[PDB]
């Protein structure tokens, strides 16, 4: 195990005046080496996604992006007020391949069903990572990587209810958020497909907790970026209520909603809470033009309640998130420098 400053790789377009392409062109390289990954037969290697120094470096890179990219109108940080120009700019995350310099190497776990922590009896040697988009969101991981086999749930400690459960889906669920043109938005999720998706998540949770009843609930409360599904779509911050998504009971039925497809009440806020460090930030009014963005729910961030005393009758899970590091561990769990 070692730690060195890694570089990155992207198909960034210099001619594109969008923040991700501009930054990547100025701080990355098209690459790549060919053709495959050097497989290591009969070699076991231990991994630890919940302590990978790769995520920390990436986290600082994602932050450094927003700093020179989205310029807020007002910035409140530790009793400090900062006002500045806030021009609107195209904002679309671009896949980034973090590569290792000369001298070191990157071990990749080929095991399709890998929890992220433990022995891996099928590793390899890669020069750089795969396509990883800087998706900043909460509750629902967007535009990530699907599982090659079954859905996989991960947690630094399933026992500790204060920990996050990084869920990976094997089948992507499409979500359509559009602002018609008032300044209000709404999202669309196939009720049929999303159902079975919850089913799959349930049988996995029920499996990890020997024998209990799985029941989803809305957010227990907190900040608007935690209570609702917060995400960036076209340089705008959306806050969509997902009380309809996480409201089902598993253990023989309970509550089924219909109406063909699910529609979530959403809205755009100018005053948001910074995800980088502690503080707030106000931005410019919504764009007069229309905003269409269709994303892909390939992952979920859930938090378990449970615990207390006197046996168990049922478990409860809620849409979690917040720490964007969890969003990177869903893509960098099978890598090791």
């Amino acid at each position: 195990e070692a730690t060195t400053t890694l570089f990155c790789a992207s198909d960034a377009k210099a001619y594109d005046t969008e923040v991700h392409n501009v930054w990547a062109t100025h701080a990355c390289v098209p690459t790549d080496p060919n053709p495959q990954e050097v497989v290591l037969g009969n070699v076991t290697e231990n991994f630890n996604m919940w302590k990978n120094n790769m995520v920390d470096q990436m986290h600082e890179d994602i932050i450094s992006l927003w700093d020179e990219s989205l310029k807020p109108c007002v910035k409140l940080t530790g009793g400090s007020v900062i006002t500045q120009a806030c021009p609107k700019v195209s904002f679309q995350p671009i896949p980034i391949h973090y590569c290792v310099p000369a001298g070191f190497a990157i071990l990749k776990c080929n095991n399709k069903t890998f929890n992220g922590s433990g022995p891996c009896t099928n590793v390899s040697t890669v020069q750089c990572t795969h396509g990883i988009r800087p998706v900043v969101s909460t509750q629902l991981l967007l535009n990530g990587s699907l599982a090659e086999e079954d859905i996989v749930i991960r947690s630094e400690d399933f026992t500790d209810n204060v920990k996050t459960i990084i869920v990976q889906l094997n089948e992507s669920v499409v979500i359509n958020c559009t602002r018609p043109n008032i300044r209000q938005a709404h999202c669309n999720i196939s009720r049929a497909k999303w159902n079975n998706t919850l089913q799959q998540i349930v049988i996995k949770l029920r499996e990890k907790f020997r024998n209990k009843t799985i029941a989803f609930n809305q957010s227990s409360g907190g900040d608007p970026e935690i209570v609702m599904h917060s995400f960036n779509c076209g340089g705008e911050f959306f806050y969509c209520n997902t009380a309809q998504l996480f409201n089902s009971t598993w253990n023989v039925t309970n509550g089924t909603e219909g109406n063909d497809i699910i529609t979530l009440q959403c809205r755009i806020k100018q005053i948001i809470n910074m995800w980088q460090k502690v503080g707030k930030a106000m931005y410019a009014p919504p764009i007069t033009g229309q905003i269409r963005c269709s994303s892909n729910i390939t992952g979920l961030l859930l938090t378990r309640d449970g615990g207390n005393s006197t046996e168990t009758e049922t478990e409860i899970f809620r849409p979690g998130g917040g720490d964007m590091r969890d969003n990177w561990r869903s893509e960098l769990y099978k890598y090791k420098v």
Partner: antibody, heavy 119, light 107 residues
Framework: QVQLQQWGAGLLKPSETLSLTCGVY????????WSWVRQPPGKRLEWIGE???????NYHPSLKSRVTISLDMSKNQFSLNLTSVTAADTAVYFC?????????????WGQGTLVTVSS | DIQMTQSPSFVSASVGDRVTITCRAS??????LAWYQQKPGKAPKLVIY???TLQSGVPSRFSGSGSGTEFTLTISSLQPEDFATYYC????????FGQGTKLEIKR
């Protein structure tokens, strides 16, 4: 060893099109990029763009709407388009190979082709 | 956009003398720089890349250093063939070069 040769019309007129071709001898186009770099008379060099064997080009911001780089994988050669040329396009265009990270420097280079646009 | 300015633009040094040309950047670029040697009616020749990494074949008298904004290309002992025009390049971003430094003989 590898040598990059360049051929094409040097003397051009306004509104016309620049079409230069750089041939590769001693190496295949595979596993390597191929970029064009011009240099105005008595000025710094300027990276125009580079194309990959996959077909995805990477042009310069102010030259995207005119520059078009392709690949002739059958003859191991690549070309450089430039629609609607003007007097400001008068320069010596070069062609160089760009390897993969960490190796990025342009190498080898071509002998260059002097281009002049006049009416 | 990052600007690359070299200094001086015109160096006068006799053969065998020690010469040192600099290249300042408007913004931080770490170690994404290269140097090239170009003679009249000829194409540039890669001298030193990665700011301080010498190209295969390049004489030992050629050396480079610096990181961030300030950079340096030093030649221990000059030779009749060393006299030419040197350019500095931002290996990434817009791949912009410098106005170049023309090294000539002194009399």
């Amino acid at each position: 060893q590898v040598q990059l040769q360049q051929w094409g019309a040097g003397l051009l007129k306004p509104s016309e099109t620049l079409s230069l071709t750089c041939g590769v001898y001693g190496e295949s186009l595979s596993g390597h990029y191929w970029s064009w770099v011009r240099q105005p008379p008595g000025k710094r060099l300027e990276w125009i763009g580079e194309i990959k064997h996959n077909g995805s080009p990477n042009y310069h911001p102010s030259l995207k709407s005119r520059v078009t780089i392709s690949l002739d994988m059958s003859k191991n050669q690549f070309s450089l388009n430039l629609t609607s040329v003007t007097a400001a396009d008068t320069a010596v265009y070069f062609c160089a190979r760009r390897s993969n990270w960490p190796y990025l420097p342009f190498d080898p280079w071509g002998q260059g082709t002097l281009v002049t646009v006049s009416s | 956009d990052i600007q690359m300015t070299q200094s001086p633009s015109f160096v006068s040094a006799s053969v065998g003398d020690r010469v040192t040309i600099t290249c300042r950047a408007s913004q931080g670029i770490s170690s994404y720089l290269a140097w090239y040697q170009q003679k009249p009616g000829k194409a540039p020749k890669l001298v030193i890349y990665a700011a301080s990494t010498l190209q295969s074949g390049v004489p030992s008298r050629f050396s480079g250093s610096g990181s961030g904004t300030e950079f340096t290309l030093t030649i221990s002992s000059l030779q009749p063939e060393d006299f030419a025009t040197y350019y500095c390049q931002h290996l990434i971003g817009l791949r912009s070069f410098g106005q170049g430094t023309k090294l000539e003989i002194k009399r």
